[PDB]
Design an enzyme around this catalytic site. Structure first.
Site, PDB file in Angstrom:
ATOM      1  N   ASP A 206     -13.378   9.721  -8.171  1.00  0.00           N
ATOM      2  CA  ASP A 206     -14.413   9.956  -7.166  1.00  0.00           C
ATOM      3  C   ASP A 206     -14.066  11.043  -6.147  1.00  0.00           C
ATOM      4  O   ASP A 206     -14.747  11.183  -5.137  1.00  0.00           O
ATOM      5  CB  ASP A 206     -14.800   8.649  -6.445  1.00  0.00           C
ATOM      6  CG  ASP A 206     -13.832   8.267  -5.321  1.00  0.00           C
ATOM      7  OD1 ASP A 206     -12.615   8.550  -5.429  1.00  0.00           O
ATOM      8  OD2 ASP A 206     -14.300   7.673  -4.326  1.00  0.00           O
TER       9      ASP A 206
ATOM     10  N   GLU B 234       0.799  -1.218   0.000  1.00  0.00           N
ATOM     11  CA  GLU B 234       0.000   0.000   0.000  1.00  0.00           C
ATOM     12  C   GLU B 234       0.837   1.275   0.000  1.00  0.00           C
ATOM     13  O   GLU B 234       0.564   2.193  -0.761  1.00  0.00           O
ATOM     14  CB  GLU B 234      -0.950   0.059   1.209  1.00  0.00           C
ATOM     15  CG  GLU B 234      -2.175  -0.864   1.129  1.00  0.00           C
ATOM     16  CD  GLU B 234      -3.100  -0.563  -0.056  1.00  0.00           C
ATOM     17  OE1 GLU B 234      -2.902   0.451  -0.759  1.00  0.00           O
ATOM     18  OE2 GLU B 234      -4.045  -1.343  -0.283  1.00  0.00           O
TER      19      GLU B 234
ATOM     20  N   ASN C  69      -8.955   5.102   2.700  1.00  0.00           N
ATOM     21  CA  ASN C  69      -9.726   6.026   1.884  1.00  0.00           C
ATOM     22  C   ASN C  69     -10.676   6.982   2.592  1.00  0.00           C
ATOM     23  O   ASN C  69     -11.481   6.595   3.440  1.00  0.00           O
ATOM     24  CB  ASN C  69     -10.475   5.214   0.820  1.00  0.00           C
ATOM     25  CG  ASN C  69     -11.120   6.082  -0.220  1.00  0.00           C
ATOM     26  OD1 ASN C  69     -12.316   6.351  -0.153  1.00  0.00           O
ATOM     27  ND2 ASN C  69     -10.334   6.540  -1.182  1.00  0.00           N
TER      28      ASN C  69
ATOM     29  N   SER D 235     -11.718  11.189  -3.911  1.00  0.00           N
ATOM     30  CA  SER D 235     -11.303  10.739  -2.573  1.00  0.00           C
ATOM     31  C   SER D 235      -9.781  10.642  -2.524  1.00  0.00           C
ATOM     32  O   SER D 235      -9.118  10.725  -3.566  1.00  0.00           O
ATOM     33  CB  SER D 235     -11.914   9.370  -2.255  1.00  0.00           C
ATOM     34  OG  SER D 235     -11.402   8.388  -3.147  1.00  0.00           O
TER      35      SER D 235
ATOM     36  N   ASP E  87      -6.475   8.370  -0.424  1.00  0.00           N
ATOM     37  CA  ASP E  87      -6.077   7.259   0.422  1.00  0.00           C
ATOM     38  C   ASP E  87      -4.958   7.833   1.244  1.00  0.00           C
ATOM     39  O   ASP E  87      -4.023   8.411   0.679  1.00  0.00           O
ATOM     40  CB  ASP E  87      -5.542   6.119  -0.430  1.00  0.00           C
ATOM     41  CG  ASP E  87      -6.526   5.685  -1.471  1.00  0.00           C
ATOM     42  OD1 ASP E  87      -7.660   5.346  -1.091  1.00  0.00           O
ATOM     43  OD2 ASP E  87      -6.185   5.719  -2.669  1.00  0.00           O
TER      44      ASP E  87
ATOM     45  N   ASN F 190      -7.575  10.220  -5.868  1.00  0.00           N
ATOM     46  CA  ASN F 190      -8.395   9.502  -6.837  1.00  0.00           C
ATOM     47  C   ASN F 190      -9.287  10.550  -7.520  1.00  0.00           C
ATOM     48  O   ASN F 190     -10.326  10.939  -6.986  1.00  0.00           O
ATOM     49  CB  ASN F 190      -9.238   8.455  -6.103  1.00  0.00           C
ATOM     50  CG  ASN F 190      -8.379   7.479  -5.297  1.00  0.00           C
ATOM     51  OD1 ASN F 190      -7.581   6.727  -5.862  1.00  0.00           O
ATOM     52  ND2 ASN F 190      -8.535   7.491  -3.974  1.00  0.00           N
TER      53      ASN F 190
END
Ligand code: NA
Length: 130
Positions: A49, A35, A60, A51, A53, A46
């Site tokens: 959408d 990750e 998220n 968002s 992380d 992102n």
């Protein structure tokens, strides 16, 4: 902060992650590795959408933490996403535990499915004293 492998393994063990909801320490290590490369400051936007992380586990903002800039998002961990960029990972661990206390478990993270599921993860805790 970018943790060294074994440093992180012991850090997560002290935080009660070894076997949490059936997930071995090695799986959590494999997750963190893929990750963020064990980097607590890692972020990923992102554009699709809107968002982001955050942190070592790339949690998220749409569902887990609040950053005030993700439309219609919630905050299941009841934390500012800022808490997920701390060098101290206790808050991120509490949130990761929250994430797995849902229908999918460790499968919530696609990265775990791609690079950890049904592969050898014991290598991540080898020689760490955990
Ligand atoms: Na949110």
């Amino acid at each position: 902060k970018v943790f060294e492998r074994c440093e992180l393994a012991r850090t997560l063990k002290r935080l009660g992650m070894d076997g949490y909801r059936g997930i071995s320490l090695a799986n959590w290590m494999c997750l963190a590795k893929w990750e963020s490369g064990y980097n607590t400051r890692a972020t990923n936007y992102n554009a699709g959408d809107r968002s982001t992380d955050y942190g070592i586990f790339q949690i998220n903002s749409r569902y887990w933490c609040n950053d005030g800039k993700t439309p219609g998002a919630v905050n299941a961990c009841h934390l500012s996403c800022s808490a997920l960029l701390q060098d101290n990972i206790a808050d991120a661990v509490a949130c990761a535990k929250r994430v797995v206390r849902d229908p999918q478990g460790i499968r919530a993270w696609v990265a775990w499915r791609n690079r950890c599921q049904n592969r050898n993860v014991r290598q991540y805790v080898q020689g760490c004293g955990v």
